[PDB]
């Protein structure tokens, strides 16, 4: 097999089965509304600019909802909001969406292609470490080679009042399960880590940061993927496998086998008839 991340074709078109298949936008929305304002209510004090740093921002768009919410709060103040992203097609991406969006005259965007990795290497050969007053790491951490080291570099650009955002899935989570039962059956891979709120938390407890985490349920209905003549459910056999063709290139065993557990109230649920995988999403609020 091959990890998912290998075939860009399927690897972008997975995903965008996924988020039409779960509740992945509407679970950070819920977030954002409702425990964002709170999170960075002193974040713009005493300052005439916001800097915000997205770290793997994708496309952007929970990228404008923070900073709607930013703006909603510092009304007036100019936001800095720069983009660490390595693929050339999302910041394309990205830029269109800006464009297309209203109200964001405040806002002065920036994009560097590259991983946070390589961001990091190349601030520590400035002059100065600058601060940044908000910054986020969605949906990510999956893809960096040193996590503790890019916690402890990232809370170290946090100035006064400075709050850093980090969202992976939960530990309690169904990819939680799914990780420790089959975690073997598949090859190393060395473009992904399976790592979930608890690696995090033990990790940030280590580095003695100072951080609060709250779970949002989340699901993701995998449904067609129990359909064997359904082309929706194979991508999403893939995302749920982190694997290229999976039913195709996996041994029918370990196949067989995950249809089966994959429908016990240990990694999803059945409502509506449906099939709801336990999404379970965790946020992760570190302070300066
Ligand atoms: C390695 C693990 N899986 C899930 C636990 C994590 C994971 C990755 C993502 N991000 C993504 C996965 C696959 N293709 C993608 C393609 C694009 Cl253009 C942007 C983000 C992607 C989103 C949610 C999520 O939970
Ligand atoms: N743990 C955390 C719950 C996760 C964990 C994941 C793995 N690796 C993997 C799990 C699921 N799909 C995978 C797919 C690929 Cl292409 C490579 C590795 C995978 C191995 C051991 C392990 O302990």
Redesign the pocket.
Known sequence: ????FSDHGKYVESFRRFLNHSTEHQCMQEFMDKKLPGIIGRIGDTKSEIKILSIGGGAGEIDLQILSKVQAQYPGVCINNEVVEPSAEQIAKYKELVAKTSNLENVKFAWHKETSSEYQSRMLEKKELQKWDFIHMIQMLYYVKDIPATLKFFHSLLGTNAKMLIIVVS?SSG??????K????????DL?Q???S??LTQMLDNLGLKYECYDLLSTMDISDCFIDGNENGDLLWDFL???XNFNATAPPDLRAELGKDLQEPEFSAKKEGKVLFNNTLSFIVIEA
């Open positions: 097999m091959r990890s998912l530990g990819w939680d399960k799914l990780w420790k089959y975690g073997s059956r598949f090859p190393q891979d992904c399976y790592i979930t608890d690696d496998t982190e694997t």
